[PDB]
Amino acid sequence: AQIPESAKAVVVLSPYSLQHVFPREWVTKSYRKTIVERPERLLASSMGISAAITMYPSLFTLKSSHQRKGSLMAPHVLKVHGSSWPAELIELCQMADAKLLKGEIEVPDTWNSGDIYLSSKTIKALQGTIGAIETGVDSIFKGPSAEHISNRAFVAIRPPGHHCHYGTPSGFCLLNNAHVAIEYAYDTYNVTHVVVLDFDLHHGDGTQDICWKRAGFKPEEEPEDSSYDDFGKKFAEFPKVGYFSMHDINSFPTESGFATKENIKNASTCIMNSHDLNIWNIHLSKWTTEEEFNVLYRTKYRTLFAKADEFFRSAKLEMNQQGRPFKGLVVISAGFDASEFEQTHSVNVPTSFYTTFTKDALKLAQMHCHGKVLSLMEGGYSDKAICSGVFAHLIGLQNQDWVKEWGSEQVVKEIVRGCKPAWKPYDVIRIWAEEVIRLGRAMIPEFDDIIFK
């Protein structure tokens, strides 16, 4: 060829993730549309993937995890979540169907049944999602020949992870995908230091909660143990994780009017290199003009990369002063619900932001991680936000330039037509869009069983 395979970014498809679906068949079909975390999100993410590959056919490699599974008992789950939550999750799923045919809510009465659901199919879905995560990590670390190994991967998985706490699910998240990826990468490839860059509209309170666990502080779920000193702390183990988020402080999990002291505090935490914590949270600002947003980016949002840069410089020093091998990774919590295209707080981001942000993540990974970048899909709910966001994210993951018209309402509207389950075709923008739609709808054959029929 000309472009070598190692120079391409890997896109990991997760066919088992399609199986997790809202199950309560006795609700209004209008309430049913209120449920935004659904299998159709993967069809929209495939449209974004298709768009990137159509613009740049030589820059991406599609990889399906197919039937590869990870165990809910695997060490990269147990060491992230303990053994009590995984076993309770499996129990709930195994009793769900029986409850659900009696018109009963399938989750515990202490949970917000409106923001979390499960069924017996959820187990296979999560096992497959773990498989797809392992595939992503393997794609960028595995092999005898470092030169023949890709550096960047995007993993199109659901349900999302960043709201799942150490021992408690919430916000449609049953498992913290990012910390599972991190633990697998540490166990399998000796990755020692990871930064998580989270540009979802929502605070990743679950990802951050588990950062506190990794610092050695006792989780709220766990019964107090003599393992912890009088301050509820013990030794912080590898891998070391730094969490860097930009999000709307007036949205979930701290929606204006519906917010607790404790969640407001976590969503506002800024601390580096102290008490075994590395956590930085920044809040989205309103803007109107293109130049207003650029000022916000250059003066406010870009500082996430500065803090993450400090994290890696400090880590290299501690490792070399101690005679230990350093190995970094940049993880992106790629959520697209802050997009201008997300369904209707006026703090949004323009579609181009996803290209810009990802390009700056590339610079960070080149300087400290030998270019290793792992992006995992998080939130993002309308067809338009997911499709346009994945598209610009992938364009930036391969260090290409965004063209403003690529994210125009006209173009995104034509692509999204292909998400309707019974889409039939019908001028330049239409011809290109139907080329994108044909590939996107074919990309996972299971779309047909789960959606088109």
Interface contacts to its own copies, rule CB under 8 A: 212, 217, 231-233, 249-250, 254, 256-261, 264-272, 274-275, 277, 279, 281, 283
Q: Cβ(113)–Cβ(169) under 8 Å? A: no
Cβ at position 253, least distance to Zn ion in Å:
10
Q: How many residues bind Zn ion (CB under 5 A)?
A: 5
Q: What span, in angstroms and rounded, lies between the C-alpha atoms of 93 and 120?
A: 5
SS3 375: strand
Neighbouring residues of 423: CB distance < 8 A, sequence distance ≥ 6:
417, 437, 441
Q: Cβ closer to Zn ion: 94 or 256?
A: 256
Cβ at position 163, least distance to its own copies in Å:
18
Phi/psi of residue 127, nearest 5 degrees: -55, -40
Task: Quote the tokens at residue 259.
Answer: 């917010």
Q: What span, in angstroms and rounded, lies between the C-alpha atoms of 143 and 140?
A: 9
Q: What is the dihedral of CA 156, 279, 306, 247, to 10 degrees?
A: 60
247 binds Zn ion (CB under 5 A): no
161 binds Zn ion (CB under 5 A): no
200 binds Zn ion (CB under 5 A): yes
Q: Cβ closer to Zn ion: 341 or 406?
A: 341
Q: Cβ(17)–Cβ(158) under 8 Å? A: yes
200 interface partner picked from Zn ion, its own copies, none, CB below 5 to 8 A per type:
Zn ion
Among residues 163, 165, 193, 203, the one annotated as catalytic is: 163
Q: Cβ closer to Zn ion: 311 or 336?
A: 336
Task: Say which DSSP state 420 is in.
Answer: S
340 binds Zn ion (CB under 5 A): no
265 interface partner picked from Zn ion, its own copies, none, CB below 5 to 8 A per type:
its own copies
Q: Is residue 283 among the annotated active site residues?
A: no
Q: What span, in angstroms and rounded, lies between the C-alpha atoms of 119 and 336?
A: 26
The window from 194-202, 211-219, 230-238, 416-424 that contacts Zn ion (CB under 5 A) reads 194-202
- Rounded to the nearest 10 degrees, what angle do helices 352-368 and 303-321 cross at? 20
277 interface partner picked from Zn ion, its own copies, none, CB below 5 to 8 A per type:
its own copies
Q: Cβ closer to Zn ion: 81 or 162?
A: 162
Q: Cβ closer to its own copies: 3 or 271?
A: 271
Task: Quote the tokens at residue 156.
Answer: 């199109």
List the catalytic residues.
Answer: 163
Q: Give residues in contact with Zn ion (CB under 5 A).
A: 200, 202, 335, 337, 379
